[PDB]
């Protein structure tokens, strides 16, 4: 089976707008087959553990509307998954698609030698969009690249000052590339890949005393902390909100020891929590801010690491100290610029507050009626989670919701949690449908427990 | 000055424009320079200065002109002998890659990552078919440095249960800038500010099987057994360093003998550039893990791919979330890659890279004979070439004199005396000639400038 | 002069029991010069900062009585330094010296091939002397070597169980060799020698909640703690007593997480705090116990690492995994066997309880009279300390006690603190002289303060 | 039996000069039982492996003459083991014994506060005994401690110069404490205790071009070599001699790269290879020289780390940066001073050369005659080794020599290799008797093999 042949077959497919029954039967077969053979058979077994019958093999085909996805069988799903935080402004958002299309006609990828205007524009726009002294931007292609950039900026800055240790928090997720993975907290994701970067240590999230104890003990032993890295709200941890004033406290702790504050808003950024950045809630200015996911408007891959001139200036004397081939390419920038405009124009941060208040109320309500299955519902803005009592119940919830054509999924660090992360553009009727389908799934699950 | 809203709307409107007033052009250029200084990196403005003449430093990128040319905001058109450091193998805005991407953008650009996505499966089947021997499984990411992190993690996951933790790379090597990849990357400049890096990384001189065998033997004796060796078939940012014929095969045998894994970083050498689809096909070395990026995205999308045997990729099956990526293998990028593979094969671009590379290098080596004055030597394999000069400053002047002639070149990350020549594989034969003529005129100018300077 | 001439001159001096006034002048001259030129000019600077006038030049010549040292000028000192904790049964304790001579008559060092009986005899005595399941002994030559053996036993036991992290406490001193140094906590002793062993972390001494957090956080990130190591009371730290129930809580915490408990009793051991081992105040059984200093009766150098058979067994398959050339030699063992015998016959640990109480009563009294100069006095048995308001006041105390012919000295991890650490054999008569000497010292100190 | 009872019993044994037959049988029975239950049962298994019948349980009792040992049964063994390099001047050497007794009469251990004279005298004597600029001494208690001190000297010196990597050689043995173990090279000794000190790498012994490549690649990547450590002759490796001029080429390579040279003469030191130090053969001055074993005259444990003023001065500003409690105690200084005297007075390095050649000639003839059992014989001075065709043949040799009351034992990195390391004071008749015994042993071995 020649490689030309495979590529020609794929090009032929990419060009099909719609599939009929026999085309769908064949594409679904090839995709399951090739997943087993060339991608990961484990992912097939995973889908089985959160669906019922043939739903494991559901193959994603196209955007339906701003907030829906369609599989190869025409089945349309309401998206409460959001690509795990990617689709803040909806699927194929017309303003974003348009911007990308326009730039695609001029030049999608830059030479990396001439001065590329959209890099300059997005960095200007980001400077203005961010708190206080956050002034300089480095663009890359993902969240983990955003965090590697942050760790490196911290390292270049703190190294000549004698500081090499990094503090993160348990529950934290910061990416799976090996530097970012040193900060990431989940044991099962870390252990096979040890030894990781030396001098990374963890303290309980939300616990200012434990953090202070770590910075102070490190000082005593001559292992002074370079930087503290944390999410404002833990995402893959299961949507964990810290106590009030904790972020402000972590900011003061860091100034006190002369440590840098790195804030990872790859997941909480771009309006999802009810404000453009989750740090704007306590009005805290980190030294380095990590952005990705939704920054590309659900159309492009992109990441950005924004810092103070003070810190970022370590990159000035030699601008090749940290580089990236694709980072800040014109297509990625056009997507990011469109997304920032859409967010502001349509006041989507404010909408996420409003829609999130509604949905979490409906979720807390269902939690009360079904403590039979549901432990608790947490959230802020359109970042929410339902924590069930067992692992198996949460898997059954995902399964039942799937049958009702609502797409949800779990959390990387938390086995008992299903997330709810819809596009911020989710319509008021669609929020009603989601609570509706949530109830029905809970009811069906209850009935299954009595059934078994 | 403005709010983010006003800034985004200004950029959004500039994005829609196709051409520029003279006063619109002048305005934009002053913006780009100003914001590069205030919000990107003023040091980059300075680097552009040291490799240009006059306000050349502030040439601002506006659009692709043809397959092999770029146009700035002033309508100046440049023959691209930089190729985005190995990105534009099939040219700028190649119609088959643009079309595939545009068609997928109409369906779905990014996936949920939850449902099975069809193009991931197709690109994975296609790469299986494209790759030598037992390379069977593909992990998709967003960059070359991400590609190499995936390689290292795969090796780590496989070798740490077998009690092996040491990674051997080579000096001169460039494997990426993220902290995992940076640990294998070898340039002192790039490494020291971020130390300590990953433990267990050791380096031997490139292209020296004698030294590499000693390394692995010593590591075995002391109980610090070698998990994997990582190398580029040809060192790119190192200054286009060709290993002696026999090297890669010897590396394969050695890895076989000690039970080390062999990682080939073909992020720059891959997708046709050296005269084959992959530079390892030259000696027919099958690696345990193959890294791709740069040109795999067709010059339209960012993509990286890590391909490995089922034996090694295995480690990811029981828990498929052991290594993941949010954007990796998205439909837009998969389309761009499948398009690219098709074009490379249809238009037989690897074969073309061999013909055009022979001519171009033959041309440069002749010029080197003529100016021992300024040039040390010219080297290359297919369309991956470099010209080494006597001084960094002679080199910087070549880049500058070339830029004045509207031919784009640039240097290499681990060798300052070296100017890379990395044109699209689609560079026309006439353009090949033009580039040699441009290079000749530049060298003569340089000779005169050094004359008066002494 | 040749090496031979130097060896002969020094062999001549060793045979001399007493010095002419002229021989004395010349000896004190050569000793100061050779310290400068061949030992450490800096140790001469240190002594000056804690003596007055030419007192810095004092050169030690012989034991006087049990509790007494005599310099080269015939000047005699009551020893309240105890060699920083080695002279527990006094200077040249007759039973210990006798054991050592008798063994020297037979065989001072062993072959390491044939079975050396005194090693079997010492290992038997210590198994009988240690609480609970502590059963096997590895003999070495110092405290720091004793801690190295302990880290290795934990490493060899816990590495196959997937655990590599070590928790120690700030203020801790566990030795200066590079493995022990990784657990030793003073910044100033650690920085020039970094990178030390990886995987070592520090929590505050005496704070159990912080220790639970470190064990728990390590468990969460896959960095599971192999062992916890600590002194029951911190010596060099400044005689830092933990809360009641702390040591026991650490034992239960280790049990809970399946970490090994290492107890560093190099200073506290052999009767020093009022019991044979300080771990006996709460009846705590560590998995590994480290001994040295006083174990050699103030006559020989020796160390011992005692462990449960569960832990020590990691050395049975290949008894050559950890070894030492001089460890467990006949003279070291004779000395230790004599020391154990003397401590038990004369009920010396119990004496240390009584005399420590009485001595700490004198110092607490003086800290009452002189808040002028003194922060507080503390102690457990005969391991006591006086904390002063300043470093210099403490240095002044040390100099005044010296002028008063009572030998004291400072603590490695606390600059405001003067140890009082006399032989357990100190008479009540001398206890009262020591308390008078300290009052006179404070009297002169207060005066000199109000001169300025 | 109680701890007190155990100590009393041991003390009576220590007093008894002779043992009758059923005193022996009781003691022997004890020694084996206590080794089993409180020391290490594996030592019994190893000793069985290199003995025959009731030979495993040889229990040693006193020195016999200068060069012999007697066990509890009255069996006298000629000592070709030398305690693995300790007994350069024999067992209970009168001059060293007398120096020790005289010092025990005054002060066996010091306060560590007053200036102890014998530390100054030994440091002066060693300065005059050592090559060139080796001037300052740090005294400790073992070989592994003097390597520890050497690594720290280099670290303190090289850390501020930006260099942190250490190069050792495969085959090497430098001690078993975790710092020294990082440079020790046998896999068996290292693996279970990893992670060790970071930044330690190994190159093949005697191959200068391999060492240049490592030093050079390290520099390229920003991981510059702080220091190189090696033995002049590898001892535990199997008595591995380097090419002539290698040692000089390492000195020059270090000069060239600005790395420190550390020479480990813990085994080769104090006369054994024909000169006082094996570096004297090629006139090499290391920056740091390590000594132990024979430095203590076969009576005391001691170690020394001697360095140039350049290097050692990193300890002047803060003389407490590296310390050890027992290091340089009067008893150990007295034993070293006497050793230096005996070695020089009795011209014993010269004797080591003569007896070395004679013994090596003898083994070389036997190798020649029994190529069925013997691979080859190597050596320099009284450091020698016989390599056999396999392990078992080597073990049979050791066992046969033991039956003939000649004591030999293996090496820790090489299992086919038997070391021959007698006192430098071995008589010429004893030299001849060892060669005859080796012959009788080999003959019995060939015959043994014949039957099978
Ligand atoms: C608690 C403790 N551990 C370890 C040591 C190290 O003992 P040494 O100097 O004999 O190596 C000491 C010395 O102060 C000590 O007090
Ligand atoms: C999603 C996530 C990342 C992951 O980055 P990638 O784009 O998947 O490489 C990093 N940080 C946080 C907080 C995340 O939620
Ligand atoms: C460019 C390069 C990389 C890193 O690629 P990025 O996309 O810039 O992260 C890795 N390996 C090689 C050989 C490269 O040339
Ligand atoms: C024996 C040896 C050591 C270890 O000495 P110890 O006193 O047992 O700690 C160190 N270096 C060399 C060369 C040795 O032979």
Numbering used by the authors:
A (entry chain B), C (entry chain C), D (entry chain D): 8 to 459
B (entry chain A): 7 to 460
Article excerpt on this structure:
YgjG is a putrescine aminotransferase (PATase, EC 2.6.1.82). Based on its amino acid sequence alignment, it belongs to the class III pyrodoxal-5′-phosphate (PLP)-dependent aminotransferase family, which include ornithine aminotransferase (OAT) and GABA aminotransferase (GABA-AT). In this study, we determined the crystal structures of YgjG from E. coli in free and putrescine-bound states at 2.3 and 2.1 Å resolutions, respectively, to investigate the structural basis of YgjG substrate specificity. The monomer comprises an N-terminal domain, a large PLP-binding domain, and a C-terminal domain.
The native YgjG crystal structure was determined at the resolution 2.3 Å through molecular replacement and refined to the Rwork and Rfree factors 18.1% and 23.3%, respectively. The crystallographic asymmetric unit contained four YgjG molecules that formed two dimers. The dimer formed extensive contacts between the two subunits. The buried surface area between the two subunits was 6,167 Å2, which corresponds to 30.2% of the total solvent accessible area. The PLP phosphate group interacts with four water molecules, Thr151, Gly150 and Thr332* (the asterisk indicating the other subunit) through hydrogen bonds. The PLP pyridine ring is sandwiched between the Phe180 and Val273 side chains.
